[PDB]
Design a protein around this ligand. Sequence first.
Ligand SMILES: [Ca+2]
Length: 314
Amino acid sequence: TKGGTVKAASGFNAMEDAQTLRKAMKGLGTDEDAIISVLAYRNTAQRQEIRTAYKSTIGRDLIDDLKSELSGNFEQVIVGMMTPTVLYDVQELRRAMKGAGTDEGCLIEILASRTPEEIRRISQTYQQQYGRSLEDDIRSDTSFMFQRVLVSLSAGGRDEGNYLDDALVRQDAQDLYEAGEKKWGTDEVKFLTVLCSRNRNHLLHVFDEYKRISQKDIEQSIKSETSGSFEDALLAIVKCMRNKSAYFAEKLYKSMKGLGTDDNTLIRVMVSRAEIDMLDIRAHFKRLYGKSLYSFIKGDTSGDYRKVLLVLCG
Ligand SMILES: [Ca+2]
Protein backbone atom coordinates (compact mmCIF):
# COMPACT_ATOMS: atom_id res chain seq x y z
CA THR A 1 0.00 0.00 0.00
CA LYS A 2 2.63 2.60 1.08
CA GLY A 3 5.83 0.87 -0.03
CA GLY A 4 9.52 1.39 0.86
CA THR A 5 11.47 4.09 2.73
CA VAL A 6 14.53 3.78 0.46
CA LYS A 7 13.99 4.87 -3.12
CA ALA A 8 16.24 5.42 -6.13
CA ALA A 9 18.02 8.75 -5.90
CA SER A 10 17.04 11.20 -8.60
CA GLY A 11 20.35 13.08 -9.29
CA PHE A 12 22.50 9.95 -8.88
CA ASN A 13 26.14 10.29 -10.00
CA ALA A 14 28.00 7.00 -9.44
CA MET A 15 31.45 8.54 -10.05
CA GLU A 16 30.80 11.39 -7.61
CA ASP A 17 29.51 8.88 -5.03
CA ALA A 18 32.66 6.78 -5.50
CA GLN A 19 34.77 9.93 -4.87
CA THR A 20 32.75 10.80 -1.77
CA LEU A 21 33.21 7.28 -0.38
CA ARG A 22 36.96 7.24 -1.06
CA LYS A 23 37.40 10.64 0.60
CA ALA A 24 35.46 9.29 3.63
CA MET A 25 37.84 6.31 4.05
CA LYS A 26 41.23 7.55 2.77
CA GLY A 27 43.89 7.97 5.43
CA LEU A 28 43.59 7.37 9.13
CA GLY A 29 39.99 7.42 10.31
CA THR A 30 36.60 7.36 8.64
CA ASP A 31 33.77 9.77 7.93
CA GLU A 32 30.94 7.34 8.77
CA ASP A 33 28.32 10.07 8.35
CA ALA A 34 29.41 10.61 4.73
CA ILE A 35 29.21 6.82 4.06
CA ILE A 36 25.61 6.78 5.39
CA SER A 37 24.68 9.99 3.55
CA VAL A 38 25.53 8.24 0.28
CA LEU A 39 24.65 4.59 0.69
CA ALA A 40 21.43 4.89 2.73
CA TYR A 41 20.06 7.34 0.10
CA ARG A 42 20.59 5.03 -2.90
CA ASN A 43 18.74 1.81 -3.68
CA THR A 44 20.40 -1.61 -3.94
CA ALA A 45 20.67 -1.40 -7.77
CA GLN A 46 22.28 2.07 -7.53
CA ARG A 47 24.74 0.72 -4.95
CA GLN A 48 25.91 -1.85 -7.52
CA GLU A 49 26.59 0.97 -10.01
CA ILE A 50 28.66 2.69 -7.30
CA ARG A 51 30.73 -0.51 -6.88
CA THR A 52 31.41 -0.54 -10.62
CA ALA A 53 32.26 3.19 -10.63
CA TYR A 54 34.55 2.81 -7.61
CA LYS A 55 36.70 0.30 -9.48
CA SER A 56 36.96 2.51 -12.58
CA THR A 57 37.25 5.90 -10.83
CA ILE A 58 39.17 5.07 -7.64
CA GLY A 59 41.11 1.98 -8.74
CA ARG A 60 39.99 0.07 -5.62
CA ASP A 61 37.28 -2.35 -4.45
CA LEU A 62 34.42 -0.80 -2.49
CA ILE A 63 33.17 -3.78 -0.45
CA ASP A 64 36.78 -4.69 0.42
CA ASP A 65 37.46 -1.13 1.57
CA LEU A 66 34.26 -0.93 3.65
CA LYS A 67 35.00 -4.28 5.33
CA SER A 68 38.51 -3.07 6.20
CA GLU A 69 37.35 0.34 7.51
CA LEU A 70 34.23 -0.65 9.47
CA SER A 71 33.54 -3.08 12.30
CA GLY A 72 30.73 -4.76 14.17
CA ASN A 73 27.03 -4.19 13.63
CA PHE A 74 27.66 -1.05 11.57
CA GLU A 75 29.87 -3.01 9.17
CA GLN A 76 27.21 -5.70 8.97
CA VAL A 77 24.42 -3.27 7.99
CA ILE A 78 26.54 -1.44 5.42
CA VAL A 79 27.95 -4.58 3.79
CA GLY A 80 24.44 -6.00 3.75
CA MET A 81 23.14 -2.83 2.03
CA MET A 82 25.86 -3.25 -0.56
CA THR A 83 24.96 -6.86 -1.35
CA PRO A 84 22.62 -7.63 -4.30
CA THR A 85 19.12 -8.45 -3.13
CA VAL A 86 18.99 -12.15 -3.99
CA LEU A 87 22.59 -12.81 -2.91
CA TYR A 88 21.91 -11.18 0.46
CA ASP A 89 19.11 -13.70 1.13
CA VAL A 90 21.36 -16.51 -0.14
CA GLN A 91 24.19 -15.45 2.17
CA GLU A 92 21.80 -15.16 5.14
CA LEU A 93 20.54 -18.68 4.55
CA ARG A 94 24.10 -20.03 4.27
CA ARG A 95 25.15 -18.29 7.48
CA ALA A 96 22.10 -19.75 9.19
CA MET A 97 23.23 -23.32 8.31
CA LYS A 98 27.02 -23.22 8.28
CA GLY A 99 28.94 -25.07 11.02
CA ALA A 100 27.18 -27.18 13.64
CA GLY A 101 24.28 -25.15 15.09
CA THR A 102 21.39 -23.76 13.02
CA ASP A 103 19.62 -20.37 13.04
CA GLU A 104 16.11 -21.81 12.64
CA GLY A 105 14.45 -18.37 13.04
CA CYS A 106 16.28 -17.05 9.96
CA LEU A 107 15.25 -20.08 7.87
CA ILE A 108 11.57 -19.65 8.85
CA GLU A 109 11.61 -15.89 8.23
CA ILE A 110 13.06 -16.03 4.72
CA LEU A 111 11.29 -19.21 3.57
CA ALA A 112 7.83 -18.17 4.79
CA SER A 113 8.01 -14.51 3.66
CA ARG A 114 9.48 -14.80 0.17
CA THR A 115 7.25 -15.63 -2.77
CA PRO A 116 7.74 -18.89 -4.73
CA GLU A 117 9.30 -16.85 -7.57
CA GLU A 118 11.77 -15.23 -5.12
CA ILE A 119 12.54 -18.61 -3.54
CA ARG A 120 13.34 -20.06 -6.97
CA ARG A 121 15.87 -17.26 -7.60
CA ILE A 122 17.37 -17.77 -4.13
CA SER A 123 17.58 -21.54 -4.62
CA GLN A 124 19.33 -21.18 -7.97
CA THR A 125 21.73 -18.53 -6.69
CA TYR A 126 22.59 -20.65 -3.62
CA GLN A 127 23.38 -23.59 -5.88
CA GLN A 128 25.53 -21.42 -8.18
CA GLN A 129 27.45 -19.80 -5.33
CA TYR A 130 28.15 -22.78 -3.11
CA GLY A 131 27.69 -25.89 -5.29
CA ARG A 132 25.26 -27.13 -2.66
CA SER A 133 21.51 -27.74 -2.74
CA LEU A 134 19.46 -25.40 -0.56
CA GLU A 135 16.97 -28.22 0.01
CA ASP A 136 19.75 -30.70 0.93
CA ASP A 137 21.27 -28.27 3.43
CA ILE A 138 17.83 -27.72 5.00
CA ARG A 139 17.38 -31.52 5.21
CA SER A 140 20.72 -31.88 7.05
CA ASP A 141 20.21 -28.94 9.38
CA THR A 142 16.58 -29.48 10.51
CA SER A 143 14.56 -32.49 11.61
CA PHE A 144 11.10 -34.03 11.73
CA MET A 145 7.95 -32.06 10.87
CA PHE A 146 9.84 -28.71 10.89
CA GLN A 147 12.19 -30.04 8.21
CA ARG A 148 9.25 -31.13 6.03
CA VAL A 149 7.75 -27.61 6.17
CA LEU A 150 11.01 -25.92 5.22
CA VAL A 151 11.80 -28.39 2.41
CA SER A 152 8.33 -27.81 0.99
CA LEU A 153 8.71 -24.01 1.08
CA SER A 154 12.18 -24.26 -0.50
CA ALA A 155 11.07 -26.67 -3.25
CA GLY A 156 8.51 -24.18 -4.60
CA GLY A 157 5.63 -26.57 -5.27
CA ARG A 158 2.95 -24.40 -3.63
CA ASP A 159 -0.01 -23.85 -5.93
CA GLU A 160 0.27 -20.40 -7.55
CA GLY A 161 -2.24 -17.88 -8.95
CA ASN A 162 -5.58 -17.28 -7.18
CA TYR A 163 -8.03 -19.98 -8.34
CA LEU A 164 -10.79 -20.31 -5.70
CA ASP A 165 -12.66 -23.60 -5.26
CA ASP A 166 -15.29 -23.15 -2.47
CA ALA A 167 -15.78 -26.92 -1.92
CA LEU A 168 -12.06 -27.43 -1.42
CA VAL A 169 -11.87 -24.42 0.96
CA ARG A 170 -14.62 -26.01 3.05
CA GLN A 171 -12.92 -29.41 3.03
CA ASP A 172 -9.56 -28.00 4.10
CA ALA A 173 -11.16 -26.07 6.97
CA GLN A 174 -13.11 -29.19 8.07
CA ASP A 175 -9.93 -31.28 7.98
CA LEU A 176 -8.10 -28.73 10.16
CA TYR A 177 -11.04 -28.71 12.58
CA GLU A 178 -10.97 -32.52 12.81
CA ALA A 179 -7.21 -32.40 13.42
CA GLY A 180 -7.99 -30.20 16.46
CA GLU A 181 -10.36 -32.76 18.06
CA LYS A 182 -7.64 -35.35 18.75
CA LYS A 183 -7.19 -36.65 22.33
CA TRP A 184 -3.61 -37.52 21.56
CA GLY A 185 -1.82 -34.86 19.50
CA THR A 186 -2.98 -33.07 16.33
CA ASP A 187 -2.77 -34.47 12.79
CA GLU A 188 0.37 -32.51 11.89
CA VAL A 189 0.57 -33.75 8.30
CA LYS A 190 -2.75 -32.00 7.56
CA PHE A 191 -1.41 -28.64 8.71
CA LEU A 192 1.68 -29.27 6.57
CA THR A 193 -0.34 -30.16 3.42
CA VAL A 194 -2.87 -27.33 3.60
CA LEU A 195 -0.51 -24.54 4.68
CA CYS A 196 2.32 -25.49 2.30
CA SER A 197 0.33 -26.58 -0.82
CA ARG A 198 -2.53 -24.14 -1.32
CA ASN A 199 -2.50 -20.72 -3.07
CA ARG A 200 -2.81 -17.52 -0.99
CA ASN A 201 -6.38 -16.62 -2.05
CA HIS A 202 -7.44 -20.17 -1.17
CA LEU A 203 -5.69 -20.03 2.20
CA LEU A 204 -7.20 -16.68 3.16
CA HIS A 205 -10.61 -18.31 2.52
CA VAL A 206 -9.63 -21.36 4.58
CA PHE A 207 -8.65 -19.08 7.49
CA ASP A 208 -12.05 -17.41 7.31
CA GLU A 209 -13.98 -20.66 7.06
CA TYR A 210 -11.92 -22.20 9.88
CA LYS A 211 -12.87 -19.34 12.22
CA ARG A 212 -16.53 -19.78 11.19
CA ILE A 213 -16.66 -23.51 12.03
CA SER A 214 -14.24 -23.66 15.02
CA GLN A 215 -14.87 -20.23 16.61
CA LYS A 216 -11.07 -19.83 16.87
CA ASP A 217 -8.50 -18.14 14.71
CA ILE A 218 -6.21 -20.68 13.03
CA GLU A 219 -3.30 -19.04 14.91
CA GLN A 220 -4.90 -19.92 18.24
CA SER A 221 -5.38 -23.52 17.20
CA ILE A 222 -1.79 -23.73 15.89
CA LYS A 223 -0.53 -22.47 19.26
CA SER A 224 -2.67 -25.01 21.20
CA GLU A 225 -1.99 -28.01 19.00
CA THR A 226 1.67 -27.76 17.95
CA SER A 227 4.98 -26.75 19.49
CA GLY A 228 8.60 -25.87 18.79
CA SER A 229 10.02 -24.81 15.43
CA PHE A 230 7.17 -26.54 13.59
CA GLU A 231 4.65 -24.31 15.39
CA ASP A 232 6.79 -21.26 14.61
CA ALA A 233 6.96 -22.19 10.90
CA LEU A 234 3.20 -22.68 10.61
CA LEU A 235 2.53 -19.33 12.35
CA ALA A 236 4.98 -17.54 10.04
CA ILE A 237 3.23 -19.00 6.99
CA VAL A 238 -0.21 -17.87 8.23
CA LYS A 239 1.05 -14.39 9.21
CA CYS A 240 2.80 -13.87 5.87
CA MET A 241 -0.28 -15.00 3.95
CA ARG A 242 -2.41 -12.51 5.89
CA ASN A 243 -0.04 -9.53 5.86
CA LYS A 244 3.71 -9.76 5.48
CA SER A 245 4.32 -6.17 6.64
CA ALA A 246 2.64 -7.05 9.93
CA TYR A 247 4.77 -10.18 10.22
CA PHE A 248 7.91 -8.13 9.83
CA ALA A 249 6.68 -5.57 12.36
CA GLU A 250 6.35 -8.43 14.85
CA LYS A 251 9.83 -9.74 14.00
CA LEU A 252 11.36 -6.28 14.66
CA TYR A 253 9.43 -5.99 17.92
CA LYS A 254 10.67 -9.40 19.06
CA SER A 255 14.23 -8.60 18.04
CA MET A 256 14.42 -5.55 20.33
CA LYS A 257 11.87 -5.91 23.16
CA GLY A 258 13.14 -7.28 26.46
CA LEU A 259 16.43 -8.70 27.63
CA GLY A 260 19.05 -8.62 24.89
CA THR A 261 18.84 -7.68 21.20
CA ASP A 262 18.74 -9.99 18.22
CA ASP A 263 20.95 -7.84 16.01
CA ASN A 264 21.12 -10.44 13.23
CA THR A 265 17.31 -10.36 12.77
CA LEU A 266 17.06 -6.56 13.24
CA ILE A 267 19.70 -5.98 10.59
CA ARG A 268 18.34 -8.51 8.11
CA VAL A 269 14.76 -7.21 8.31
CA MET A 270 15.81 -3.55 8.06
CA VAL A 271 18.14 -4.17 5.10
CA SER A 272 15.86 -6.64 3.25
CA ARG A 273 12.61 -4.65 3.62
CA ALA A 274 13.71 -0.95 3.44
CA GLU A 275 12.98 -0.77 -0.29
CA ILE A 276 9.88 -2.96 -0.29
CA ASP A 277 7.41 -2.25 2.50
CA MET A 278 9.06 -0.38 5.37
CA LEU A 279 6.34 2.31 5.40
CA ASP A 280 3.72 -0.41 5.83
CA ILE A 281 5.85 -2.16 8.45
CA ARG A 282 6.02 1.14 10.37
CA ALA A 283 2.26 1.58 10.20
CA HIS A 284 1.55 -1.96 11.45
CA PHE A 285 4.21 -1.65 14.20
CA LYS A 286 2.53 1.48 15.54
CA ARG A 287 -0.93 -0.17 15.45
CA LEU A 288 0.31 -3.33 17.16
CA TYR A 289 2.60 -1.85 19.81
CA GLY A 290 1.52 1.79 20.30
CA LYS A 291 5.11 3.04 19.85
CA SER A 292 6.96 4.06 16.68
CA LEU A 293 9.45 1.68 15.08
CA TYR A 294 11.89 4.61 14.91
CA SER A 295 11.72 5.00 18.68
CA PHE A 296 12.44 1.28 19.26
CA ILE A 297 15.57 1.48 17.15
CA LYS A 298 16.56 4.79 18.77
CA GLY A 299 16.14 3.33 22.27
CA ASP A 300 17.80 -0.03 21.66
CA THR A 301 20.86 0.77 19.49
CA SER A 302 23.62 3.37 19.46
CA GLY A 303 26.44 4.82 17.45
CA ASP A 304 26.74 4.70 13.66
CA TYR A 305 24.77 1.43 13.74
CA ARG A 306 21.78 3.32 15.16
CA LYS A 307 22.26 6.18 12.66
CA VAL A 308 22.06 3.95 9.61
CA LEU A 309 19.15 1.88 10.95
CA LEU A 310 17.21 5.11 11.56
CA VAL A 311 17.69 6.16 7.93
CA LEU A 312 16.48 2.72 6.77
CA CYS A 313 13.43 3.24 8.98
CA GLY A 314 12.71 6.74 7.70
CA1 LIG B 1 40.55 5.31 6.85
